[PDB]
User: What shape does this take?
Amino acid sequence: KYENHTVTLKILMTLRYVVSDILKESRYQYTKFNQPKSKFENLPQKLLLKREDVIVLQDPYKVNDGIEEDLEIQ
Amino acid sequence: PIQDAKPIDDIVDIMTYLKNGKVLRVKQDNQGDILVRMSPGKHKFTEVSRDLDKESFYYKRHWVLYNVSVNSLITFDVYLDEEYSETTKVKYPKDTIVEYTREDQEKDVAMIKEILTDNNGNYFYALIGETMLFDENKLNKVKD
Amino acid sequence: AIQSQEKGTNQLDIGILDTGTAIGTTQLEKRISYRDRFTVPEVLMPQQ
Amino acid sequence: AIQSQEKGTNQLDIGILDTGTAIGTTQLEKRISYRDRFTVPEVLMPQQ
Amino acid sequence: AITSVDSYLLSEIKPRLNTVLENCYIIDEVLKDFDYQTRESFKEAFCGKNAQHEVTVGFNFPKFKNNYEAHYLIQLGQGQETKNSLGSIQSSYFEATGDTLVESSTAIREDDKLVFTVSKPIGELIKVEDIEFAKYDNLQVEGNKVSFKYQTNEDYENYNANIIFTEKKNDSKGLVKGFTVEEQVTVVGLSFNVDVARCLDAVLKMILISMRDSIEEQQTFQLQNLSFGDIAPIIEDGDSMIFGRPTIIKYTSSLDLDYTITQDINKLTFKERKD
Amino acid sequence: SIEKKEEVIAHNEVVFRSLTQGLYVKEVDIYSDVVSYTKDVDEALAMPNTINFKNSRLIMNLDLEPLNKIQKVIYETHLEGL
Amino acid sequence: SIEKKEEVIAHNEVVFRSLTQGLYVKEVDIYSDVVSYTKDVDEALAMPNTINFKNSRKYKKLIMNLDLEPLNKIQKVIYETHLEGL
Amino acid sequence: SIEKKEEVIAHNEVVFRSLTQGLYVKEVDIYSDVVSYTKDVDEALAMPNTINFKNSRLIMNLDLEPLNKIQKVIYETHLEGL
Amino acid sequence: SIEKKEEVIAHNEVVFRSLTQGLYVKEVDIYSDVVSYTKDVDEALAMPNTINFKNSRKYKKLIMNLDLEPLNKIQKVIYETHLEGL
Amino acid sequence: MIYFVNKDRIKKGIPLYYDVKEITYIATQDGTVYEEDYEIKNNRLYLNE
Assistant: This one.
């Protein structure tokens, strides 16, 4: 029916981001208190994220689990 | 009977076959089918593939690491990849909600217990709680 | 964690374009790399 | 809610032009889109 | 035949550059005017079959990191139309023809003729090395092979000849419509060591000189001109600067398209009139 | 299997080789006496393998082991089934 | 007396044949059903099959058609060096 | 209803078709023997449908089922009332 | 023997006729009352009536005039392919 | 990072743009690569034929 008609859509899409820079990239602590020995732990990175508009890829194909959500137990 | 399915029951047999290195096919819910494999060489770890078709000169499978969960294996159905049948041309799949009528003209719901056929291609279906066979027309596919 | 999320629009001769800065903060022991990708199923964005 | 409302005037060869920034803050669960339109009947603006 | 100058440049540069850097004699000939220090350092680094360091070449804006010890960088540049013919007509052909090929082919004996075999059929024979066939030899081409009289030439039964020829595509005929384009392409060498950049530029100049004997640009990309920029710091934001000297190469090529013709006359209807 | 095949002889030459060292000749002097040797089989000095040249000048040294070198280049195609 | 040997692959692409008609496909419609045919291998609906182009998508409907027989058309050039003594 | 109408014949040709496969001819060889077939009705090989051509060369193959193809293109207008 | 058929619309526009006079409008004044007339369909105050131009405003006063009879002038070109056998 | 292999680089060894501490993941057109097929010496990489 719409061979030569125009069509317009208002659409909802998942939010997505890519890492365009890594900023304050590494922060460190020699944690020693209440440890057998000195341990090195990497504290949180800060990321400068960028939206995906020019090129769009579908949501990744995650492997599902067969555990039913909100499952009764007795 | 039909030889189109041979599901594995025990996870122990699944692990035994994985040790032998044979590929597996693992179904999903409203989602693409998966192939699973054990990596060769020194380091042993699971690998997965989103592709399904047989390997050929024009088609090669892609394998990557993934932390596969035993829950998926134990819960979801599993088959040997080489011996899997793509489709059995029947209206209703196995383990599907269906509706029928009992011997006393009483309507009742059930799931398909077995899928059968004669030599002429006519398909007969057996429901849970019903030993007798049912025609394709006599059944009704219940809407979710 | 995510902050400062911006849907910066540039109108040009080629057309409209969506690009903006969003600042995120990870957990410990995670080493992100350049041009890594994230997707948030929970949050939906309107487009026309 | 609305803030910082500005009636920025640019005088040019084409003529005068009214353009300015106004910063607004919505309620919860509302997902605004680019080039949406608002009108405030209560507030009247003088022009000549 | 649409021309992609960048791909031709890459294909000419890569094997030729590898061959030039393979041996030391050619490099010493090239770097005659340079001082001992830079010459020997470049020879130690890049020259020789067993060289540990290696140069690379590629186009601009690569998403991956690119080696900046020594690299040839190409970018397409501008272009312009300079000359045209009447009706945009360049040439007329009776048989569709592709590229011009050069093949070596040892002579063979056939019961009446000496012949040369070739990989592909022949649309037209341009030249046979060191031969000028006379009428007596009755040069004939029959698809894949070319042939000449056996008896009076029998001394040359195994002549180690080579052939310059043209591929055959179809028997159809058409017109060549197109024009000439004057194109500029930019080439720059990159190195954090300026002396390496200088030597790289000299090598580039030599291979450009050597290319002028190539068949393709002899037939397609005539009128080569060169222009060199100043040594400049390409980047300053790194720990150390990148130094490079851009060079601009000009070429003239004929963008053209083959317009086929289906009209073929084979009969005539000469009749008079009466009144 | 084969659908189409053709063979051609790209080159046919005579290679010179030393009898003691076993290395082929690479470079020569004014009279074409040997000054350099090489282990390569293809880069070695060679001349056209035809009677006219042979009659037109073995002549350089008593290490009389020339080697007729013939290069066969073959074009072929296959249609391998599934 | 093969002194040395080498092999080269020039082209490696897939070509389809009808099992019964014996023709080779050349053209398809928007639905990707066959429209034309040829009895010439040199003119066929070639699908590239080099290393980079494996696992294509353009011809999934065509592949599943049972009437068609895929063929791996491969072209080679082999160089053989002969030492024939004196 | 119709206010004005005119009919013209844009083309009038003869199309060749196979008797067994049912596909029309698309491409041909030097002698105009068939090398390709097509399912299209319009793209098929065709020649002018006039006696002079027919006398000036059916001739290619024994699959003797030509098809006279005639194209009618019509221009018309309507004045449909309310 | 219509092998195939197709239709095309070139123009689709409205034209008005006076019920009594039988003439077609060509011109109007600033008040949009009729000023001129013609007895030629090819020269009339055409209002575009394609898909995009529906629900116009230029001729509301003209439409409500009971003396005028709107007409949907539509022009078409139809292609018919005939196979007449041998 | 990414590199292109040829008949010459296979024997010399790939010169890496960066230094090496350990490798996370290798891949090629034929898929991943195992420890049995590659080795690293003096910050350059070797591969089998």
Notes: Helices of chain F lie at 51-55. Residues 20 and 63 of chain F are 9 Å apart (CA to CA).
